[PDB]
Amino acid sequence: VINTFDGVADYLQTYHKLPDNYITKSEAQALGWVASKGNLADVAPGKSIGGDIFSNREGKLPGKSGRTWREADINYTSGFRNSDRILYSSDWLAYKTTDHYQTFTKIR
Ligand SMILES: [Zn+2]
């Protein structure tokens, strides 16, 4: 699976899509994923949560009309989700967060 900051970052900029080990939260729920139980690895082996729209309500990531922000989990293998996320824009900007969206730094 591609689930490293660099790996994912690089695949996105070239191919313009997340690698196939990613699924959105609603797709995972539909397969039996129960967030409170941390069972993703059981119902969707080798998948990580990724691809959902990220709000940017607190305007922490730089905006621009027509720009949409998405998120993907990084370094996830099994159990409860971690605090690692890659945030990528529709124009292929890539930012990293290791602390649950508190802070971000550019990686691409
Ligand atoms: Zn393309």
Strands 69-73 and 85-89: antiparallel
Measure 67 CA to ligand 1 centroid, in angstroms. 16
19 C-alpha to ligand 1 centroid (Å):
13
> What residues contact residue 93 under an 8 Å CB cut-off, 6+ apart?
62, 106, 108
Phi, psi of 43 (to 5 degrees): -100, -15
Ligand 1 center–CA 12 separation, angstroms:
9
Strand order in the sheet with 85-89: 22-23, 48-53, 69-73, 85-89, 94-97, 105-106
In the PDB record, what is the listed experimental method?
X-ray
Spell out which residues have Cβ within 5 A of ligand 1, the ion. Answer: 16
Domains of the chain in start order, with CATH, are: 1-108 (3.10.450.30)
Which residue numbers are catalytic? 71, 100
